[PDB]
């Protein structure tokens, strides 16, 4: 999920936006 | 472990800031 | 409104802690 | 919904749990 | 007590309830 | 150790929310 | 007043940092 | 106590030290 | 500066970019 | 002065997130 | 690296509180 | 660097002050 993805390596702002509605 | 728990706390702050009014999906499973 | 914006940032932190594995949607 | 209810008045953990998935 | 417990594993809110007040 | 130190900061925030008007005592000793 | 409730959250973080090993008195 | 003293006006670092053990 | 600009109306993350070095 | 203080705390966190490697300019 | 990223988020908060009106520069690399 | 000096061993608030403008 999101935690596995962004807490094992740093998500950039582009990668975080993937999660907005 | 706990460190994933502490990270997930900064993660949600960062999502809140990034997504503004849109809001975001947060279903950790 | 900034006051409402900073209040949402604390709400998202509290829900994170309260909801645990279940998560939550925050639209706002 | 939540902002209206929890930003103008203090919400407990119990009431915040209503907004969980 | 609390750091040993809650920093090596995740404490529930009800586990944290003990440490009030 | 920084990790325990960062963890203490999140614990104190979580206690603040759980304990409300009762307060709490945070001895890290 | 969520005003003071939000403030209080910044305050305990500040106390934790200032007091370090000593701990602190938090009886609102 | 501390919440009215320090959430009414900002407390300096020294004023915060008042509430350490 | 940034206080005047961003403490009464919300600054976007794109407006915050201006203060990056 | 309290609002200003609490807002500054959130701004510095947001600046950190957006500026990353580059750092930022901060003086209030 | 994530641990350094997390520590940085707390460092910035501590600096803000300690430095106050003076401000600080925070260039993490 | 501050990250190097403060991200493995804890910097006191007095060490942090060295980094204020
Ligand atoms: Zn943290
Ligand atoms: Zn706040």
UniProtKB/Swiss-Prot annotation, chains A, D, E, H, I, L:
Disulfide bonds join 6-11. It comes from the Eukaryota. This is Insulin A chain.
Swiss-Prot record, chains C, G, J:
Changing residue 10 to D: In HPRI; Providence. This is Insulin B chain. It comes from Homo sapiens (Human).
């Amino acid at each position: 999920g999101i935690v596995e993805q962004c807490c094992t390596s740093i998500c950039s702002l582009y990668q975080l936006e993937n999660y907005c509605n | 472990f706990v460190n994933q728990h502490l990270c997930g706390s900064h993660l949600v702050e960062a999502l809140y800031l990034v997504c503004g009014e849109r809001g975001f999906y947060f279903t950790p499973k």
